[PDB]
Design an enzyme around this catalytic site. Structure first.
Site, mmCIF file in Angstrom:
data_model
loop_
_atom_site.group_PDB
_atom_site.id
_atom_site.type_symbol
_atom_site.label_atom_id
_atom_site.label_comp_id
_atom_site.label_asym_id
_atom_site.label_seq_id
_atom_site.Cartn_x
_atom_site.Cartn_y
_atom_site.Cartn_z
ATOM 1 N N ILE A 4 -6.287 -6.026 -0.605
ATOM 2 C CA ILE A 4 -5.062 -5.833 0.089
ATOM 3 C C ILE A 4 -4.171 -4.719 -0.481
ATOM 4 O O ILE A 4 -3.321 -4.545 0.014
ATOM 5 C CB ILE A 4 -4.448 -7.195 0.151
ATOM 6 C CG1 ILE A 4 -3.882 -7.602 -1.201
ATOM 7 C CG2 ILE A 4 -5.155 -8.294 0.994
ATOM 8 C CD1 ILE A 4 -2.894 -8.933 -1.124
ATOM 9 N N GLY A 5 -4.551 -4.197 -1.493
ATOM 10 C CA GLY A 5 -3.911 -3.167 -2.230
ATOM 11 C C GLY A 5 -4.325 -2.519 -3.275
ATOM 12 O O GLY A 5 -5.483 -2.766 -3.557
ATOM 13 N N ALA A 6 -3.785 -1.550 -3.920
ATOM 14 C CA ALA A 6 -4.134 -0.766 -5.226
ATOM 15 C C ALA A 6 -3.170 -1.013 -6.252
ATOM 16 O O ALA A 6 -1.832 -1.279 -6.051
ATOM 17 C CB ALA A 6 -4.350 0.939 -4.978
ATOM 18 N N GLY A 9 -6.818 -0.715 -10.666
ATOM 19 C CA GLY A 9 -7.329 -1.852 -10.456
ATOM 20 C C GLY A 9 -6.827 -2.058 -9.013
ATOM 21 O O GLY A 9 -5.938 -1.430 -8.485
ATOM 22 N N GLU A 10 -7.580 -3.071 -8.328
ATOM 23 C CA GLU A 10 -7.265 -3.289 -6.849
ATOM 24 C C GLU A 10 -6.796 -4.672 -6.503
ATOM 25 O O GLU A 10 -7.136 -5.627 -7.477
ATOM 26 C CB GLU A 10 -8.814 -3.292 -6.050
ATOM 27 C CG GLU A 10 -9.462 -1.998 -6.222
ATOM 28 C CD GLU A 10 -10.402 -2.164 -7.291
ATOM 29 O OE1 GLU A 10 -11.436 -1.131 -7.627
ATOM 30 O OE2 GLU A 10 -10.519 -3.241 -7.927
ATOM 31 N N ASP A 24 13.214 -0.071 -7.025
ATOM 32 C CA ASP A 24 12.642 0.151 -5.672
ATOM 33 C C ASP A 24 12.828 -0.853 -5.031
ATOM 34 O O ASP A 24 12.179 -1.529 -4.003
ATOM 35 C CB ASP A 24 11.086 0.379 -5.942
ATOM 36 C CG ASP A 24 10.425 0.886 -4.866
ATOM 37 O OD1 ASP A 24 10.912 1.626 -4.048
ATOM 38 O OD2 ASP A 24 9.040 0.718 -4.770
ATOM 39 N N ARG A 80 9.917 -3.522 2.053
ATOM 40 C CA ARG A 80 8.773 -3.213 1.949
ATOM 41 C C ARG A 80 8.383 -3.991 0.665
ATOM 42 O O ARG A 80 7.243 -4.537 0.433
ATOM 43 C CB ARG A 80 8.053 -2.012 1.904
ATOM 44 C CG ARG A 80 8.653 -1.095 0.852
ATOM 45 C CD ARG A 80 8.096 0.275 0.753
ATOM 46 N NE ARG A 80 8.898 1.006 -0.336
ATOM 47 C CZ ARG A 80 10.163 1.644 -0.206
ATOM 48 N NH1 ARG A 80 10.549 1.731 0.974
ATOM 49 N NH2 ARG A 80 10.625 2.374 -1.134
ATOM 50 N N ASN A 81 9.156 -4.445 -0.071
ATOM 51 C CA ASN A 81 9.224 -4.966 -1.483
ATOM 52 C C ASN A 81 9.613 -6.430 -1.469
ATOM 53 O O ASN A 81 9.601 -7.220 -2.562
ATOM 54 C CB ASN A 81 9.529 -4.261 -2.679
ATOM 55 C CG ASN A 81 8.565 -3.155 -3.123
ATOM 56 O OD1 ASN A 81 7.315 -3.056 -3.299
ATOM 57 N ND2 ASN A 81 9.132 -2.046 -3.634
ATOM 58 N N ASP A 122 7.592 -6.421 -6.523
ATOM 59 C CA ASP A 122 7.543 -5.168 -6.622
ATOM 60 C C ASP A 122 6.036 -4.649 -6.705
ATOM 61 O O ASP A 122 5.216 -5.064 -7.571
ATOM 62 C CB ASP A 122 8.174 -4.705 -7.913
ATOM 63 C CG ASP A 122 8.097 -3.083 -8.098
ATOM 64 O OD1 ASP A 122 7.334 -2.341 -7.383
ATOM 65 O OD2 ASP A 122 8.795 -2.426 -9.194
#
Ligand SMILES: Cc1ccc(C(=O)Nc2cccc(C(F)(F)F)c2)cc1Nc1nc(-c2cccnc2)nc2ncccc12
Length: 275
Positions: A20-22, A26-27, A135, A139-140, A153
């Site tokens: 679901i993300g990077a 790692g993923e 940030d 979106r966070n 974050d």
């Protein structure tokens, strides 16, 4: 020692299911934790550097330190086995920016303002803990099934449109630059996820800010809410409210909800003439 407020989780208790993300190295996965509980899982995979390891365990360490209703909760960490993992709660409704864009106009003003109060309370907690987010943006922020917003974050970042001038100009990131960002988040929430400054380029945004222009009022926006976001965008850092001020104002507006019925004037870009 970095992991004082964190729980060590054994790998047999974790199942990764989908990317679901990077991460930095790692993923990020959706997964399950042991009845079974859904989780997000950030891995640190073989070959990571010394600096990546310090940053990864440091992130886990600071996250374990946070215990607040409006901050993403750390379930725990895998540090004794490889790959290392940071495991957090998983919030079914996902990130706030996409959530609002997919639910345009579906909430009451009081619901929207309550989301901002929760975000503000999380940020007040972070600022008091001497943590600068750097940030803060919709979106966070994750949303749960009770509409509770949790500051997170995801590390996908300088986000010019959300960032205070002094942080852009000379890299002064403080809780007061996070206040500027919060003002942008307020505008994101009240517009159901509109893009700040629309199609202006990053250079055009900075030029407009430096010339004194500010985002206009969202449609249907309470006057007190627009006044508050405008004060978050003061050029002089010391003149912005602190998060304690923001939490106090939002709590008072919610507790006297007739205060939110007075709406700021919307400037219409289009005019339609009808009889
Ligand atoms: C696994 C993980 C590790 C760390 C963080 C994270 O928020 N770290 C962090 C670091 C510094 C400061 C803060 C703070 F202060 F809480 F905002 C948080 C979040 C997560 N969880 C995540 N959840 C989710 C997610 C997506 C959809 C529904 N529920 C969770 N997506 C993520 N995407 C990329 C990276 C991490 C994601």
């Amino acid at each position: 020692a970095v992991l004082k407020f964190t729980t060590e989780i054994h790998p047999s208790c974790v199942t990764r299911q989908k990317v679901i993300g990077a991460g930095e190295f790692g993923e990020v996965y959706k997964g399950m934790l042991k009845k079974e509980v859904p989780v997000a899982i950030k891995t640190l995979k073989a070959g990571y550097t010394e600096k990546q390891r310090v940053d990864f365990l440091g992130e886990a360490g600071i996250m374990g330190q946070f215990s607040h209703h409006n901050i993403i909760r750390l379930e725990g960490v895998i540090s004794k086995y490889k790959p290392m993992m940071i495991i957090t709660e998983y919030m079914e409704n996902g990130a706030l920016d996409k959530f609002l864009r997919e639910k345009d106009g579906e909430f009451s003003v009081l619901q929207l303002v309550g989301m901002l109060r929760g975000i503000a309370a999380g940020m007040k907690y972070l600022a008091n803990m001497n943590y600068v987010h750097r940030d803060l943006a919709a979106r966070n922020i994750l949303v749960n099934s009770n509409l509770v917003c949790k500051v997170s974050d995801f590390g996908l970042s300088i986000p010019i449109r959300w960032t205070a001038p002094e942080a852009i100009s000379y890299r002064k990131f403080t809780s007061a630059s996070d206040v500027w960002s919060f003002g942008i988040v307020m505008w994101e929430v009240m517009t159901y996820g509109e893009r700040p400054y629309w199609e202006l380029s990053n250079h055009e945004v900075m030029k407009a800010i430096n010339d004194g222009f500010r985002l206009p009022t969202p449609m249907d926006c309470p006057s007190a809410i627009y006044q508050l976001m405008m004060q978050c965008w003061q050029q002089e850092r010391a003149r912005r409210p602190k998060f304690a001020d923001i939490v106090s104002i939002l709590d008072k507006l919610i507790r006297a909800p007739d205060s939110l019925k007075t709406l700021a004037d919307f400037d219409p870009r289009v005019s339609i003439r009808l009889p």
